[PDB]
Write a structure and sequence with these properties.
The structure is cut from a larger assembly and holds 2 copies of chain A (339 residues) and 2 copies of chain B (337 residues). Chain A has 339 residues and is an alpha/beta fold. Helix content of chain A is 23%, strand content 22%. In chain A, the strands form 2 sheets. In chain A, strands 3-4-5-2-1-6-7-8 form an 8-stranded mixed beta sheet. A 7-stranded mixed beta sheet of chain A has the order 10-11-9-12-15-14-13, with helices on one face. In chain A, a hairpin with a 2-residue loop joins strand 4 (66-69) and strand 5 (72-77). In chain A, helix 1 packs across helix 9 (321-336). Chain A is globular. Chain A starts with a strand and ends with a helix. By secondary structure, chain B is of the alpha/beta class. The longest helix of chain B is centred in the middle third of the chain and has 15 residues, at 155-169. Chain B contains 7 helices and 16 strands. In chain B, the strands form 2 sheets. An 8-stranded mixed beta sheet of chain B has the order 3-4-5-2-1-6-7-8, with helices on both faces. Chain B starts with a strand and ends in a 5-residue tail after the last helix. Chain B folds into 2 domains: 2-151 and 317-336, NAD(P)-binding Rossmann-like Domain (Rossmann fold); 152-316, 2-Layer Sandwich (Dihydrodipicolinate Reductase, domain 2). Chain B is globular and about 65 Å long. Classes of the chains: A alpha/beta (339), B alpha/beta (337). The complex binds nicotinamide-adenine-dinucleotide (NAD) (4 copies). The site of one nicotinamide-adenine-dinucleotide (NAD) has 24 residues of chain A, from helix 1. The PDB classes it as oxidoreductase. The entry lists the keywords Photosynthesis, Calvin-Benson cycle, redox regulation, oxidoreductase. Single Particle Cryo-EM structure of photosynthetic A10B10 glyceraldehyde-3-phospahte dehydrogenase from Spinacia oleracea. Chains A, D: Glyceraldehyde-3-phosphate dehydrogenase B, chloroplastic.
Chain lengths: 339, 337, 337, 339
């Protein structure tokens, strides 16, 4: 029904397209991709993925600019300047801006100027421009006519928010810190080379790398009540995908026990957050969460309250797939709330 | 004496600078460094290396356009287009082109324009350019050459002991495969690239890519033209690589005779370049190795009397740099005007 | 129709069980599993695999001495000494010996004593034992053999396409080197081992180790006795490996002719075993590949008309398992007593 | 002056020997090693180390059981049963039990029965009979005649304790949780295989692996005042060496600021803990702490107080080298307090 464009055919963008393909019957319909590499470079990488594994479906190169996933064509253009994009010509309704460059009002909006109707950023805004939504938390807050540029937050923030809510909304979060052992990412250097952040400039694959992260503060953007109460760092570790968060907020409520904190999740898990949150009691490891549709999974056996007031949780989330899956839900929303 | 300028303070840029600091009475003298990165960037990474480890020396950020190394001060500039670099203003006699882009007549030349006198390309030259592999034909050099390439990290390994073979058993023909550590060129995560192989994971695969070192040998060992050729495999390791040569010689020979020959040369002519090692080691055991190539004796094996296979280790970063320095070390000697 | 017992529920043990579950109408039937690990251990790891990923099937810990897979129940026992296993009591017709210790007449035999009828060794046999490589000589098998080995993961790759070569160009002699993923055998951190190489880091080095697949080829291709031989390089990857063969044939030939021959066989006789791939891929792109060997066409190259080099990928875990099953799949057929 | 034996020539034991060699003039004198592999397997690995790099010194194989490090001989025996050991024959004064098996009174004591004078365990004791020391904290508490079996604690506990002290001793620790992104270790499987802990049984090299750790509780063993107030988990990440701790204790004192918390360390660092603690202000990454003589290093820029009461610290420690270095100090003690 609704025509979708994907600006940025990399991990998240490709993880998107994949997520979307094998789906119920999304109102969405990818008809164009903007990968600065042609049909070749854009096809190959959709078919063979080192982290998701060979894509299960006939992917052929039709035209000199039109590959096809099981017959369904997908026109592919390439230009760094959105302004030159045929959004209007093709009549693009939604644009999944997944480049990490156009994250401010002026920028991401260049897509509207090209002829796009609505723009979804697969990352946190570039400033105070644009709302930030997190399916499971405050998706309702989105309604047509209300800004034509939205941000599906961060991979981390989209993993935290959900279970951060259930914590405050059913135990009252005084305030707390947090850390996130995170799988390295494209923004990191492969080997020690120049980079604006002397931490990311180090061999992404052979170091535990500390790097700031707003993912903590931004929780507020969706959960105002916490505004300026959370916060933390992040640690990059030699693991191509799937990460974990280590939240430590000393609660306001009584001094509940461990396994009950859990139950809250478990409750809100099979209830309001059925599809977002979840609790896995079986002791596994990162690799067991590859391709996990849940925006956040708590390691039951890891949760532990210390001094009655201080609660500690640990959650599992596939940063590529998970987020991409929400990004398809948030784009699924736009369409369900469209004239 | 000879004023030098490092352009492209990357892995070979730094591995070089440091390789240099360790030499005694070096005809070379670094004075300027040009890299897209600020003085901060140059300092930090020269001091803290994830492969060579923290640098033993005092490295501070002295200046807005300079850094200090044990007192010796060096200027750090940053122009993505060479022509601008004040090579002429600083009287740059030699430029160590380690950027990976300026590998052709046209490109490397922009350095000459900037006022530089010579340009040593820390990689194979593209097109018609003098290629020299210290130990394999450095006598071919003449102060006349304004632009020379010190070949690749692989060629600089494979060459030395190939010379030894041919020059003793006669290489008829032969392929080779280099199991190579990954490099800045590969993508950390499946991302676009002009080599859909190199475009893959890098740390999660054995990435077959092609290498010139195959034909490049011939570049410096004229005799082997079109006799050698191979591929390469990029495996999950940040440094030190191994080559698997397989030549067919004329003179029937056996296992230990081959190795012997190697040792002999390694103790005489190639002393400092080639070397043998019997102690059964592994990659990591070959970091910071001043030599270009190291034969794993216990691995060498012959078939049907004429098919020889030789495994050889080499630190694609350090060992190469040490060569780069040795080449520039040469340009300083046999330098007239 | 044929009762089976998996002894050594390790990587090949599980990679097999699962390889099996996917086959349609399998003459094989697993009933008992013996591994040093408890029912917990057997369940978990059959369900959650770090290389094959979570198993698509319902796997619960049904029993104190059993586990359930989609309902099919299986017993899990644990005796470090085979003789004790109730093979006779359960009427075990075949035992899949994947422990890595019982690879000799004496050892594998303890299974026969326990009451088992046959013992398929998921590795090369040590001493005088029937070695068969599905696709290379499975017709040599006869229900008479009580103990057979399905060769190594490497041999099972190298063999198929070697047959193709010799059987068409005549292999005179030739070496080979297999860049191989690491295995349970290596030490995770510099620790004691009988192979001071394998004893090293494993994940931080290219570990040269030796392989039998070299001479083992001859085991199944009698013609090449003493014509092949190579080494192996253990690089930081948990699975999928590549072989770099280099044979000298009699009949002068060229690049695409070779590849052609391969394809032909891959489409006819070896259909299901060998296969070619032009799409420039990498390691990871070859997980779960039912075939034993896959030629990387674009890499194949010839020298001086008679020296042929062929690169070939293979999933040392899955692809092998699929062979193991195919072999056991055979024992079930052509089974009289 | 004092004869030392090393039971268990692996990482920690070898890291020991190395630590000891290039030293001022330790009263210690390694004269025997117990590596179940002979002079070959024991030599090779002392000379070529994947994590420390080729050992700088002539290491030759004399006798069939007596290698030598620069001339100085070292007799080498091998037997899993300490009872058969020639401790008495050789007259061994100290034994560095670094196997991780003999960690209880009955066990580690088998060395005394063989003829050993004193035994130091390079790990936490499983008994309760044995004293746990942590150089920098409570080393004084050790005096001859007082137990002939001591434990130099854990790698983690020996990194925590030090700066945990300064925290409570100059700010008052109410209680808090902690996490530790830890470099994988020998006890982990290389590839998914049977192991009593279904977490450690997963590919040490390709997973973030959560595994319990007492290192937290054991802090008390040296710092009673905290008994039952700390606690936490641990995460194994694909990094052969050098780890980091993430402590989150909400303080008792006022509601001090970040950079002052630091100053305490900085103060106690160049003062009483000169050689144990230290603070590095320059943003580095794991690999930059290899061969670090400090039992603990705090990442200045990472520290951060949240709600006035909740303090968060991050420390760097080389688990192999560091610990081994303390283990040589703790063995250095025994000798300085010997009749
Ligand atoms: N995959 C993940 O783990 C993950 C997690 C959550 C969110 N994200 C976010 O996704 C964003 C994209 O990063 P990535 O991981 O996909 O990296 P990537 O490099 O794989 O993807 C970038 C893509 O954008 C294209 N591109 C770059 N600049 C462009 C321009 N000016 N015009 C048009 N196309 C352009 C590139 O060609 C490439 O296809 C980042 O902001 C990241 O934070 C990624
Ligand atoms: N590391 C090896 O194994 C090895 C050895 C032999 C050959 N080489 C050659 O070394 C050279 C450098 O590559 P590397 O390995 O150092 O990796 P690298 O990518 O870290 O080095 C390139 C550096 O050049 C800088 N640079 C790029 N354009 C520049 C410009 N216009 N002006 C100034 N600086 C610029 C970049 O900022 C970067 O720091 C290449 O030519 C490569 O082929 C690599
Ligand atoms: N994975 C490969 O690449 C591959 C393929 C071909 C051949 N092989 C060979 O096959 C053999 C099987 O090893 P694997 O690959 O399955 O890995 P593995 O080492 O995990 O398998 C061995 C398993 O057998 C169990 N075991 C050992 N002794 C036992 C006993 N007495 N009783 C019961 N169980 C016992 C161990 O606990 C372990 O789970 C190895 O020798 C290997 O070299 C491996
Ligand atoms: N270096 C580190 O990573 C580190 C950190 C801090 C403390 N530790 C502790 O040190 C201990 C040693 O383990 P490791 O990590 O050095 O592993 P390791 O396997 O490398 O060391 C164990 C050594 O003890 C020997 N050994 C084992 N059982 C024996 C027995 N019964 N009799 C005699 N010798 C025996 C082994 O042969 C080997 O040489 C563990 O408890 C570990 O927690 C190690």
């Amino acid at each position: 029904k609704l025509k979708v464009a994907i600006n940025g055919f990399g991990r998240i963008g490709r993880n998107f397209l994949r997520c979307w393909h094998g789906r119920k019957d999304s109102p969405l319909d990818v008809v164009v991709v903007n990968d600065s590499g042609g049909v070749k470079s854009a096809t190959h990488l959709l078919k063979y993925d080192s982290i998701l594994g060979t894509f299960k479906a006939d992917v052929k190169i039709i035209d000199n600019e039109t590959f096809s996933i099981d017959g369904k064509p997908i026109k592919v253009v390439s230009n760094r300047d959105p302004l030159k994009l045929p959004w209007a010509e093709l009549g693009i309704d939604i644009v999944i801006e997944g480049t990490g460059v156009f994250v401010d009002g002026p920028g991401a909006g260049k897509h509207i100027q090209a002829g796009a109707k609505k723009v979804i950023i697969t990352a946190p805004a570039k400033g105070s421009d644009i709302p930030t939504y997190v399916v499971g938390v405050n998706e309702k807050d989105y309604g047509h006519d209300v800004a034509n540029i939205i941000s599906n937050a961060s991979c981390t923030t989209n993993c935290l928010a959900p279970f951060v809510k259930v914590l405050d909304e059913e135990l009252g979060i005084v305030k707390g810190t947090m850390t996130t052992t995170h799988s390295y990412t494209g923004d990191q250097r492969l080997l020690d080379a120049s980079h604006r952040d002397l931490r990311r400039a180090r061999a992404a694959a052979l170091n535990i790398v500390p790097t700031s992260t707003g993912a903590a503060k931004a929780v507020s953007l969706v959960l105002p009540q916490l505004k300026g109460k959370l916060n933390g760092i992040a640690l990059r570790v030699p693991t191509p995908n799937v990460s974990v968060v280590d939240l430590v907020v000393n609660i306001e409520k009584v001094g509940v026990t461990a396994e009950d904190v859990n139950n809250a999740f478990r409750k809100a898990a099979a209830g309001p957050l059925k599809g977002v949150l979840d609790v896995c009691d079986i002791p596994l490891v990162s690799v067991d969460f590859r391709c996990s549709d849940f925006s956040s999974t708590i390691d039951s056996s890891l949760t532990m309250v210390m001094g009655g007031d201080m609660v500690k949780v640990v959650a599992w989330y596939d940063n590529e797939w998970g987020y991409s899956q929400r990004v398809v839900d948030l784009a699924d929303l736009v369409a369900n709330k469209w004239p | 004496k000879l004023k030098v300028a490092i352009n492209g303070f990357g892995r070979i840029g730094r591995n070089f600078l440091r390789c240099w600091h360790g030499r005694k009475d070096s005809p070379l003298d670094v004075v300027v460094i040009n890299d897209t990165g600020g003085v901060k960037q140059a300092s930090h990474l020269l001091k803290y290396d994830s492969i060579l480890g923290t640098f033993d020396a005092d490295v501070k950020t002295a200046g807005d356009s300079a850094i200090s190394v044990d007192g010796k001060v060096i200027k750090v500039v940053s122009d993505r287009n060479p022509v601008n670099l004040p090579w002429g203003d600083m009287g740059i006699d030699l430029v160590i082109e380690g950027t990976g882009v300026f590998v052709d007549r046209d490109g490397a030349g922009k350095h000459l324009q900037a006022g530089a006198k010579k340009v040593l390309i820390t990689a194979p030259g593209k097109g018609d350019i003098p290629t020299y592999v210290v130990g394999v034909n450095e006598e071919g050099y003449t102060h006349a050459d304004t632009i020379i390439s010190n070949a690749s990290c692989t060629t600089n390994c494979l060459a030395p002991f190939v010379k030894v073979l041919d020059q003793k058993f006669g290489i008829i023909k032969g392929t080779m495969t280099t199991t190579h550590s990954y490099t800045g060129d590969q993508r950390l995560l499946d991302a676009s690239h002009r080599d859909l192989r190199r475009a893959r994971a890098a740390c999660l695969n054995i990435v077959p890519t092609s290498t010139g070192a195959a034909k490049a040998v011939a570049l410096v060992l004229p005799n082997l033209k079109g006799k050698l050729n191979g591929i390469a495999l990029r495996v999950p390791t940040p440094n030190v690589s191994v080559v698997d040569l397989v030549v067919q010689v004329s003179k029937k020979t056996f296992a230990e005779e081959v190795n012997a020959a190697f040792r002999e040369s390694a103790d005489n002519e190639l002393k400092g370049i080639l070397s043998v090692c019997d102690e059964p080691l592994v990659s990591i055991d070959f970091r910071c190795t001043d030599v270009s190539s190291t034969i794993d004796s216990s691995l060498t094996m012959v078939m049907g009397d004429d098919m020889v296979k030789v495994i050889a280790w080499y630190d694609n970063e350090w060992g190469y740099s040490q060569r780069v320095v040795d080449l520039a070390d040469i340009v300083a000697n046999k330098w007239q005007a």
